[PDB]
Scaffold this active site. Structure first.
Site, PDB file in Angstrom:
ATOM      1  N   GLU A  35      45.262  -6.194  47.876  1.00 47.42           N
ATOM      2  CA  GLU A  35      44.343  -5.205  47.269  1.00 47.42           C
ATOM      3  C   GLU A  35      43.280  -4.867  48.306  1.00 47.42           C
ATOM      4  O   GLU A  35      42.636  -5.764  48.833  1.00 47.42           O
ATOM      5  CB  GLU A  35      43.706  -5.807  46.014  1.00 47.42           C
ATOM      6  N   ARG A  99      47.759  -6.042  42.366  1.00 42.26           N
ATOM      7  CA  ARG A  99      47.278  -5.050  41.370  1.00 42.26           C
ATOM      8  C   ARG A  99      47.924  -3.704  41.672  1.00 42.26           C
ATOM      9  O   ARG A  99      48.715  -3.613  42.600  1.00 42.26           O
ATOM     10  CB  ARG A  99      45.742  -4.952  41.358  1.00 42.26           C
TER      11      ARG A  99
HETATM   12  C1  LIG Z   1      31.173  -5.062  43.843  1.00 37.91           C
HETATM   13  C2  LIG Z   1      30.647  -4.977  42.447  1.00 37.91           C
HETATM   14  C3  LIG Z   1      29.273  -4.848  42.228  1.00 37.91           C
HETATM   15  C4  LIG Z   1      28.769  -4.740  40.942  1.00 37.91           C
HETATM   16  C5  LIG Z   1      29.618  -4.767  39.839  1.00 37.91           C
HETATM   17  C6  LIG Z   1      29.083  -4.652  38.465  1.00 37.91           C
HETATM   18  C7  LIG Z   1      27.925  -5.325  38.088  1.00 37.91           C
HETATM   19  C8  LIG Z   1      27.408  -5.203  36.814  1.00 37.91           C
HETATM   20  C9  LIG Z   1      28.020  -4.399  35.872  1.00 37.91           C
HETATM   21  C10 LIG Z   1      27.451  -4.260  34.485  1.00 37.91           C
HETATM   22  C11 LIG Z   1      26.463  -3.108  34.391  1.00 37.91           C
HETATM   23  N1  LIG Z   1      25.534  -3.255  33.266  1.00 37.91           N
HETATM   24  C12 LIG Z   1      24.483  -2.226  33.291  1.00 37.91           C
HETATM   25  C13 LIG Z   1      23.497  -2.446  32.169  1.00 37.91           C
HETATM   26  N2  LIG Z   1      24.159  -2.443  30.864  1.00 37.91           N
HETATM   27  C14 LIG Z   1      23.204  -2.711  29.785  1.00 37.91           C
HETATM   28  C15 LIG Z   1      25.257  -3.409  30.838  1.00 37.91           C
HETATM   29  C16 LIG Z   1      26.228  -3.177  31.970  1.00 37.91           C
HETATM   30  C17 LIG Z   1      29.165  -3.716  36.249  1.00 37.91           C
HETATM   31  C18 LIG Z   1      29.691  -3.839  37.524  1.00 37.91           C
HETATM   32  C19 LIG Z   1      30.986  -4.897  40.053  1.00 37.91           C
HETATM   33  C20 LIG Z   1      31.499  -5.003  41.340  1.00 37.91           C
HETATM   34  N3  LIG Z   1      32.884  -5.175  41.530  1.00 37.91           N
HETATM   35  C21 LIG Z   1      33.898  -4.439  41.008  1.00 37.91           C
HETATM   36  N4  LIG Z   1      35.110  -4.479  41.467  1.00 37.91           N
HETATM   37  C22 LIG Z   1      35.914  -3.561  40.809  1.00 37.91           C
HETATM   38  C23 LIG Z   1      37.299  -3.364  41.186  1.00 37.91           C
HETATM   39  N5  LIG Z   1      37.970  -4.404  41.684  1.00 37.91           N
HETATM   40  C24 LIG Z   1      39.254  -4.221  42.029  1.00 37.91           C
HETATM   41  C25 LIG Z   1      39.885  -3.019  41.859  1.00 37.91           C
HETATM   42  C26 LIG Z   1      39.124  -1.985  41.331  1.00 37.91           C
HETATM   43  N6  LIG Z   1      39.647  -0.777  41.138  1.00 37.91           N
HETATM   44  N7  LIG Z   1      37.844  -2.163  40.999  1.00 37.91           N
HETATM   45  C27 LIG Z   1      35.297  -2.904  39.795  1.00 37.91           C
HETATM   46  S1  LIG Z   1      33.649  -3.359  39.682  1.00 37.91           S
END
Ligand SMILES: Cc1ccc(-c2ccc(CCN3CCN(C)CC3)cc2)cc1Nc1nc(-c2nccc(N)n2)cs1
Ligand SMILES: Cc1ccc(-c2ccc(CCN3CCN(C)CC3)cc2)cc1Nc1nc(-c2nccc(N)n2)cs1
Ligand SMILES: O=c1ccn([C@@H]2O[C@H](COP(=O)(O)OP(=O)(O)O)[C@@H](O)[C@H]2O)c(=O)[nH]1
Ligand SMILES: O=c1ccn([C@@H]2O[C@H](COP(=O)(O)OP(=O)(O)O)[C@@H](O)[C@H]2O)c(=O)[nH]1
Ligand code: NA
Ligand code: NA
Lengths: 229, 229
Positions: A35, A99
């Protein structure tokens, strides 16, 4: 002959990278496409990806659209390149994808929309782009291997893998992703714009027990599954 | 036989839409692909586009990457669809594109990077996506018709066309876009990752004088130009 394409699906730290690098070694007919996001988390793609990951940790609601579009384009090109460059003198060729294009959209991008890290316009643009980008396709899957682990197992494995930025991920988040994988791959309750996915064969493997030095039974189920395709 | 593809290039309100809708009518062998951004500025694409335009007016530095990626994907699909659906019983078929994939990147997206409305990572991702998206291509141009007007002419024509949101565009901005078009299409000083563009034929037409009821001399130069291709 025709390369078989198998997606390995699973929650964060279920053990997909561990499993894929076991499979890699067992046969000259078996190749692996890691990935892109995984590699960025370890060169111009690598440089863009590192910057987007760091930017995402700060401000998911600003970067989710940019991140998801680039993560999916990077996967599509790395998968296409493995399909065109490798396993051509092989007799029973298999490509194991860490994936898929479908996890990108129906797990991650969907989850980010549902957390309001993408607004409706960003999610609609993302789905349009995804629908269309994946026709202009020979990446269609022969089968999916689901590595099923509890949120708790995955939470333990995040601690084991010991990446600074991941030590903050809470059980609740993993329980959300877990639920999405159960709906998609086990109960098969999740609808998608990819008709053939409804009929794609799924092998579900319980990887709650450590397998790093004890994987023969899992590989036996993979070889049986492959013989059916 | 083989459809000829001609891009019509020019600054904002140079008269590309006016010119294209003149050409449209003069021959059953002549078809036109209007610019998606133009149509959004007048249905799910239309709904996404309207939202992105409005969002851009508020905050260019948040939406430039999203806008440019969607504007270019929308152009690629509308151009592909005209290539596959139209002019098939025609003997000397010509498709006139309102702008191109190359104006999207080397004029607009470039200009937005240069105004810091995209950061380096967004611009690098955009160029990677553009380079790759335009291989996975039969949209290659037979020739470019440059509609050359002064910034002042274009500024007057923005007033004539009388779109609320455009009445704010200043001469300085148009002088920037003008300069980019002169470098690209006249002095041919602009380098690009598309080798064949260096050798693509360009017809330059002065459209400073109103042509709406007096276009025969311009169409004569278009017919001569077409005979050389
Ligand atoms: C690097 C990173 C940093 C940050 C985040 C992240 C942090 C927090 C939140 C919740 C936010 N909240 C805000 C306020 N609200 C009240 C509730 C919610 C969402 C996300 C996530 C990632 N990694 C990811 N990796 C993928 C990923 N991995 C593989 C394949 C693919 N296609 N994507 C997706 S997110
Ligand atoms: C809708 C809209 C809203 C806004 C803008 C816009 C406004 C201001 C500025 C300057 C920002 N400054 C910030 C502070 N600094 C000190 C100086 C600079 C840049 C942009 C522009 C558009 N239209 C576009 N249309 C295309 C377009 N048209 C066809 C095809 C294609 N690919 N793109 C591009 S921008
Ligand atoms: O059976 C296993 C599977 C994984 N791991 C560890 O759990 C973490 C997560 O595995 P991996 O990175 O392969 O998960 P992925 O995110 O690729 O699913 C890593 O530290 C592995 O070494 C383990 O100890 N035993
Ligand atoms: O020779 C011309 C060309 C254009 N226009 C007007 O100038 C504006 C800009 O033309 P258009 O929208 O075709 O420009 P584009 O943005 O498509 O280049 C419109 O109100 C046209 O009706 C004009 O009065 N005479
Ligand atoms: Na191998
Ligand atoms: Na016509």
């Amino acid at each position: 002959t025709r390369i078989k394409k198998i997606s390995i699906e699973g929650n964060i730290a279920a053990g997909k990278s561990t499993f894929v690098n076991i499979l890699k070694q067992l046969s000259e007919d078996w190749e692996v496409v890691p990935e892109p996001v995984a590699r960025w988390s370890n060169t111009m793609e690598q440089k863009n990806g590192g910057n987007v990951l760091q930017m995402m940790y700060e401000k998911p609601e600003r970067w989710s659209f940019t991140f998801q579009t680039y993560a999916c384009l990077s996967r599509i090109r790395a998968q296409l390149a493995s399909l065109n460059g490798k396993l051509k003198d092989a007799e029973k060729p298999v490509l194991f994808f860490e994936r898929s294009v479908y996890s990108d959209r129906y797990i991650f991008a969907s989850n980010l929309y549902e957390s309001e890290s993408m607004n409706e316009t960003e999610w609609t643009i993302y789905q349009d782009w995804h629908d269309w980008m994946n026709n202009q396709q020979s990446l269609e899957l022969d089968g999916i291997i689901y590595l099923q682990a509890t949120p708790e197992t995955c939470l333990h494995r995040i601690y084991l893998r010991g990446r600074n930025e991941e030590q903050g991920i809470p059980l609740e988040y993993l329980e959300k992703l877990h639920y999405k994988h159960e709906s998609w791959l086990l109960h098969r309750t999740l609808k998608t714009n990819f008709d053939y996915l409804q009929e794609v064969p799924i092998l579900t493997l319980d990887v709650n027990e450590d397998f790093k030095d004890k994987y023969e039974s899992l590989v036996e189920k993979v070889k049986e599954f492959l013989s059916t395709l």
